[PDB]
């Protein structure tokens, strides 16, 4: 719903299981922990030179 709405934050529990799955979930080690996908800019398509390689003499 809209952010300026009462129905936006009316889900208080039940969204997340308290137990984490033992296959992909991990803990935050700290600032030096390189998180996959984390980027300062809003990137709706977070690709890099490996997933979407550029074909040019230099990287833009």
């Amino acid at each position: 719903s809209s952010i300026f709405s009462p129905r936006y934050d009316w889900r208080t529990s039940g969204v997340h299981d308290i137990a984490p799955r033992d296959e992909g979930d991990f803990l935050y080690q700290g600032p030096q922990h390189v998180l996959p996908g984390a980027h300062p800019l809003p990137l709706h398509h977070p690709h890099n030179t490996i997933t979407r390689p550029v074909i040019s003499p230099y990287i833009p």
Binding site: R11, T12, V15, I18
Partner: protein, 52 residues
């Protein structure tokens, strides 16, 4: 992924905030709300409730 942030407290309680298309600043604010509240009671702010 579930666009929500959850906080699990020491008394076994949970508090979830919705973060769908919400700015990272708003996510930070709701995370600070989580770390600030204790999630043990819900009482009104009235004259008969100012003193616990």
């Amino acid at each position: 992924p579930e666009m929500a942030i959850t906080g699990v407290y020491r008394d076994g309680s949970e508090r979830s905030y919705n973060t769908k298309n919400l700015s990272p600043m708003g996510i930070f604010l709701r995370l600070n709300n989580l770390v600030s509240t204790a999630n043990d009671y819900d009482q009104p702010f009235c004259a008969s409730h100012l003193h616990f």
